[model samples]
Target: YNKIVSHLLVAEPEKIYAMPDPTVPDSDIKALTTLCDLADRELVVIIGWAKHIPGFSTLSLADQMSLLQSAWMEILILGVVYRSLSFEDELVYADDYIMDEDQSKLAGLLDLNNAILQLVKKYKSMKLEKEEFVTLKAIALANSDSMHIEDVEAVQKLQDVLHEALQDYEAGQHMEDPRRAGKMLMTLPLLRQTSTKAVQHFYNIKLEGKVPMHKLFLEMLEA
Candidate 1:
């Protein structure tokens, strides 16, 4: 699935470049481009993983490329859906107290998410240097983990839905309305239990498998 998707991401340029412009006053085109570029970097990492693994290719080269294209597109969709939510959250608190924890933190999340989103979009669309690519990929992963850490239920559902969507896309049936899927996920009881695990995973990935920072922050974030 990744092989197919990365191939398309590497092969096609325009599909990612023409993403819908954010209809907000603070939308940064350069930052968005950075995210798209980072997305391309992400595709490479995924493909590198697929290349060494066995039984990944389920289709002919042509069909696989098609699936890859769609898969990459869906990933972009994921980024958009996630970041749009970030945007919406900030807009909700836009006129409130300037330095309020809720408002400031929400704004930070929005900025970080958009930065990663644009870089991811560009990365999936273009061929980048190894250093730049790795740096971008790292930023994307860190930002994603940060964003995921904020909303326990959202990230858990995000992880599950993404896994499922990848499977479905590989079978040639990507989600028709990714945003709707995200919205639907907001209603589940499973979401409430998602925070602990989500933050755990975030710490696992970010802290090099250490539990000290994980424990302390988890205590604070969930408290």
Candidate 2:
């Protein structure tokens, strides 16, 4: 466990088996394992993508990790909200498990669901596109207000690049609707705020010791 683990391709069910609750169903534990694995994979992709962004690699390693900690929750929520659009009121987890509003509530994720649904509604109404999603995600990562950031100007410079690109995209794609770009950019602040709720949810879960989360997944969340 001393080495730096790169990514999680699969989750170890043994961790779930070791949970304090002996009555926990195997099916439920398996679902949680799948969720942890999926989140880890997403974190790996995010880290790799962030490293490629212009000026990102120049930051100190500590600063880069700080930015990831600050932005990963929002990025994960954004990804989930985007996926949930296909299922209407339901959220798709691990690419297969579907949790309806009631199911999410049963799983103790009602608060998280509410925040994500609000975001989903806004994104759906705005008709957000894939390009805009990626650009906005990158902008969020680059512009993160992490306390440990060693070079704010460098991060902001990268954000500027993403911001300009997003603006150009919106202008060219929706020439008739100039307001669309502004509307999309406006969601960034809301996304940042909503992510706080998500962090709180995960923190409480960790405290309750009910749902099992992998070390890597916890590291991604608590980074």
Candidate 3:
């Protein structure tokens, strides 16, 4: 347990093993809407988690907002992917509401569904460790190279820190595979792609006007 992963244990949201009781019929809208509700709560956790982290707080407010705005969804996806590691060929949308291809098809996200599941499968293949997974969360957050960034040096400097942190961790712990660190870093795009689809899906929820949107999400989405 290193600084990055250790801090993550505190910052990371705890996994929900089941939905709040008193059963309701599971419908597509109920499922997606509940997902949205939990997502809103998770975003709050994500915000404080990012803002209070060591290197990130040094970033300017705009830079912080921009970085979070840019990468927030994927940060959650990284969490989602990690949580899914507990299940087999399924995604823990919420532990109670496990999502599979059937669920994805119902939601019109079959392709996106497979994309995320495949990421879970890939990480599972690597037997990604808890320590390693947390490092990637920060790595994924700091990995942003958005043109809107105020101080490229600051961002890269932070990025380099995580690179060293994870690389050092891998070399020390996963010496069996020299390229393990590089492979983990390269997987960012896979997370990025899933986040892209999730962005579109959230917009669909917002635009399609089926569920009552939360003001927190409304503010984030509007901005």
Q: Which candidate's TM-score is highest?
A: 3
| Better TM-score candidate (1, 2) | 2
**TM-score of candidate 2 on Cα atoms, chains taken together:** 0.82
lDDT of 1 at 80: 39
Which digits, one per residue and each the tens of the lDDT, describe model 3 over residues 1-223? 3566677667766675436334766666776677777777777878878865668999998888777777777887887788899787687877676788787778676787788888999999888988888788887788765658998888988888878888888887887899999999888898998888888877877898987768766666655
Q: How well is each residue in 1-223 modelled by candidate 2, as lDDT tens digits? A: 1010111112111111112233545344344555666777677767776766666778889888888999988887777777677668777653556667776765667777787888888888887766677667777887779888777887788777767777777777788998877788899888998888878767776777766777767996666
lDDT-best of 1 and 2: 2
State, as a TM-score between 0 and 1, how close model 1 is to the true structure. Answer: 0.26
Most lDDT-accurate candidate: 3
lDDT of each: 0.34, 0.70, 0.78
Ranking by lDDT: 3, 2, 1
The candidates, ranked best first by TM-score, are: 3, 2, 1
Candidate 3 positional error at 201, Å: 2.4
Which portions of model 1 miss their true places by more than 4 Å? 1-27, 49-55, 79-223
Clashes of each: 25, 0, 0
- List runs of model 3 lying over 4 Å from the truth: 16-25
